[PDB]
Amino acid sequence: MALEICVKAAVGAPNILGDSPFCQRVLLSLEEKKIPYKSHLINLGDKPQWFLEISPEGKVPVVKIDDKWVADSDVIVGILEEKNPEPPLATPPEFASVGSKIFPSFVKFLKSKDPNDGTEQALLEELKALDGHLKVHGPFIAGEKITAVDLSLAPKLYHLEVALGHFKNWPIPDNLTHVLNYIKLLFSRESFKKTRAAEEHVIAGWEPKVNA
Ligand SMILES: O=C1O[C@H]([C@@H](O)CO)C(=O)C1=O
Residues 105, 74 within the same domain = no
- The total of other beta-carbon atoms located within 10 Å of residue 30's CB is 25
Give the residue whose CA is nearest to atom 5 of ligand 1. Answer: 209
Residues 84, 122 within the same domain = no
Cβ atoms of 29 and 81 closer than 8 Å = yes
Residue 145 is given by DSSP the state S
Residues 6+ apart with CB under 8 A from 45: 52
Q: In sequence order, which ranges of the chain are alpha helices (DSSP H)?
A: 21-32, 76-82, 95-109, 116-137, 148-163, 179-185, 189-193, 200-206
CA 103 to centroid of ligand 1, rounded, Å: 11
Ligand 1 pocket, residue 152 CB under 6 Å: no
Phi and psi angles of residue 7, each rounded to the nearest 5 degrees, phi first: -140, 140
Q: What distance in Å separates the CA atoms of residue 62 and residue 76, rounded to the nearest whole number?
A: 8
Q: What distance in Å separates the CA atoms of residue 30 and residue 72, rounded to the nearest whole number?
A: 15
CA 163 to centroid of ligand 1, rounded, Å: 9
Residues 18, 115 within the same domain = no
Task: Provide the CATH number for the domain around residue 105.
Answer: 1.20.1050.10
Residues 33, 122 within the same domain = no
Q: Which of 200, 190, 204 is nearest to 24 (CA)?
A: 190
Angle of CA points 204, 111, 158, to nearest 5°: 60
Residues 6+ apart with CB under 8 A from 175: 128
Residues 59, 143 within the same domain = no
The letter for the amino acid at 194 is K
Estimate the crossing angle of helix 116-137 against helix 95-109, to 10 degrees.
Answer: 150
CA 153 to chain centre: 5
Q: What distance in Å separates the CA atoms of residue 141 and residue 49, rounded to the nearest whole number?
A: 36
Residue 145 backbone zone (phi > 0: left; psi -120 to 50: alpha; other: beta): beta
Cβ atoms of 16 and 197 closer than 8 Å = yes
Q: What distance in Å separates the CA atoms of residue 159 and residue 11, rounded to the nearest whole number?
A: 14
User: What is the secondary structure of 156-211 as a DSSP string?
Assistant: HHHHHHHHTTTT------TTSTTHHHHHHHTTSHHHHHTTPPPTHHHHHHHSGGGT
Ligand 1 pocket, residue 13 CB under 6 Å: no
Give the residue whose CA is nearest to atom 2 of ligand 1. Answer: 107
Give the burial string for 151-190 (b: 16+ CB within 10 Å, else e). bbbbbbbbbbbbbbeeeeeeebeeebebbeebbebbeebe
Q: What distance in Å separates the CA atoms of residue 95 and residue 179, rounded to the nearest whole number?
A: 13
* End-to-end CA, the chain: 33
CA 21 to centroid of ligand 1, rounded, Å: 8
Q: What distance in Å separates the CA atoms of residue 136 and residue 178, rounded to the nearest whole number?
A: 9
Phi and psi angles of residue 89, each rounded to the nearest 5 degrees, phi first: -115, 10
Residues 6+ apart with CB under 8 A from 186: 154, 155, 157, 158, 192, 193, 196
- End of a domain among 89, 123, 145? 89
Which residue range is the domain that position 15 belongs to?
A: 1-89
What is each CA distance from 39 to 106, 152, 174, in whole angstroms? 26, 19, 36
Q: What distance in Å separates the CA atoms of residue 96 and residue 24, rounded to the nearest whole number?
A: 19
- Quote the number of domains for the chain: 2
Residues 117, 174 within the same domain = yes
Residues 25, 117 within the same domain = no
